[PDB]
Design a protein around this ligand. Structure first.
Ligand SMILES: CCCCCCCCCCCC
Ligand SMILES: CCCCCCCC
Lengths: 62, 55
């Protein structure tokens, strides 16, 4: 029965490892989730420079 | 006739390791208590769970 319990645990671990292999393959194929294969690009600096150019339009003058 | 002199008192430490390994084996026997009586070969049917466990 210890062999039965260890075989059940190892078979469920093998099934979860196979399932996470298909999940990681489908995640890296389409780049869908933010966690693993997502290469993050931000538009923060473009918005910062556009906001700064918007404040600089008010300060033009004499 | 044994030949263990006064330097044989160092050997209590490997027997302590034997006790540590035996305690860890007992704890792993306690960890594997799922399917203790639910196996199809040694498991009695329902209504007879009032007896002591086999191991
Ligand atoms: C030379 C004296 C040897 C015995 C005393 C020192 C070692 C003790 C070990 C105790 C292990 C539990
Ligand atoms: C590797 C474990 C050493 C200590 C075991 C203590 C057990 C009570």
């Amino acid at each position: 029965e210890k062999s039965l319990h260890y075989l059940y645990e190892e078979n469920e671990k093998a099934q979860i490892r196979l399932l996470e292999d298909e999940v990681r393959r489908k995640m890296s194929e389409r780049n869908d989730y933010q966690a693993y294969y997502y290469r993050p690009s931000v538009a923060k600096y473009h918005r910062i420079s556009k906001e700064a150019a918007d404040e600089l339009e008010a300060l033009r003058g004499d | 006739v044994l030949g263990l002199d006064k330097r044989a008192l160092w050997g209590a430490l490997p027997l302590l390791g034997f006790a540590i390994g035996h305690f860890l084996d007992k704890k792993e026997t306690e960890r594997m208590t799922m399917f203790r009586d639910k196996s199809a070969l040694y498991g009695r049917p329902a209504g007879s769970e009032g007896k002591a466990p086999s191991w």
